[PDB]
Design a protein around this ligand. Structure first.
Ligand code: 5Z4
Length: 125
């Protein structure tokens, strides 16, 4: 298991935006409570799950636990960095797991909900 992605930036000032408020209070909150969220709420523990090839295939690990902490810690300078992390999390799932696997159906359900919410992302302001 690699160290988890950094979730706090000591060199970054605290700044709210409409889009980051939306990404935490609407997007993350809605995905987090979903019945299929749980496999995505923490980094893949390749040791506990005995997946010796996972971190060989996945160069950029990402999960909603990391995204949640990043939003709570105001880690993201803008909405697009956060959207990129969600996209990476889904991509990792689709490139590692066989199509139609339970985890892929769970990712597809969450991604459908994610894109539903991102389509209603507030304007930059
Ligand atoms: C401390 C105790 O020690 C242990 O027993 C260690 N092993 C366990 O606990 C393992 N678990 C729980 C668990 C936790 C997080 C996981 N995250 C993933 C996962 C994998 C992959 C490649 C991936 O790409 N991503 C993004 C996530 N998986 C794999 C599963 C993902 C969903 O479809 C089925 C494989 C996870 C597994 C399960 O076996 C367990 C379980 F899988 C259940 F579905 C379940 N539901 N019910 N009822 C349940 F009760 C389970 F306990």
């Amino acid at each position: 298991n690699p160290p988890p992605p950094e979730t706090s930036n000591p060199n970054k000032p605290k700044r709210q935006t409409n889009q980051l408020q939306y990404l935490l209070r609407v997007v993350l909150k809605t995905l987090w409570k979903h019945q299929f969220a749980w496999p995505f709420q923490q980094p893949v523990d390749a040791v506990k799950l005995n997946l010796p090839d996972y971190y060989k295939i996945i160069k950029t690990p990402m999960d909603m636990g990391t995204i949640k902490k990043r939003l709570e810690n105001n880690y993201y300078w803008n909405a697009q960095e956060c959207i990129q992390d969600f996209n990476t999390m889904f991509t990792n799932c689709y490139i590692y797991n066989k199509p139609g696997d339970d985890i892929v159906l769970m990712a597809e359900a969450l991604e459908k909900l994610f894109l539903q919410k991102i389509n209603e992302l507030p304007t930059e302001e």
